[PDB]
Amino acid sequence: KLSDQIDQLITETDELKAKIREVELRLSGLKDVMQIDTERTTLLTEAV
Amino acid sequence: NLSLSFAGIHTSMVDAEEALNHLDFMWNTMLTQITTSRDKFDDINDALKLTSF
């Protein structure tokens, strides 16, 4: 029984460690959008 | 997961918020200018002397 506890625990970690993958895949995608506005200013203030 | 679904829907409405406000203000400008054109045009009658016309 005590081994089966760890078998769930290793399963519950990597299922949850799959969740932080999608968050980091999202957050890195969102910070990419946040850099667009920074270079939109350097584009426009030059073009102004 | 559903929070992210509404998050875009909320993001779509914020851009739809600002867009309609500029849309309403142009029609409100136009509906004013048609109205103040019509009401001043109701003064037009044959008794008006020609400079005042």
Partner: protein, 49 residues
């Protein structure tokens, strides 16, 4: 006519197109936020040249 550094600009145009395809938001409205921004900026560099 003071100072125009298009080396900082034509990079910045290109990175906006670079970050357009690169982004991994996984949402459907930023996906047509950036596409409308980036297709302007590419056409902005073309129409300036």
């Amino acid at each position: 006519y003071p100072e125009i550094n298009i080396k900082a600009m034509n990079q910045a145009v290109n990175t906006i197109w670079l970050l357009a395809q690169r982004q991994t938001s996984g949402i459907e409205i930023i996906n047509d936020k950036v596409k409308r921004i980036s297709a302007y900026s590419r056409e902005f560099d073309e129409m300036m040249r």
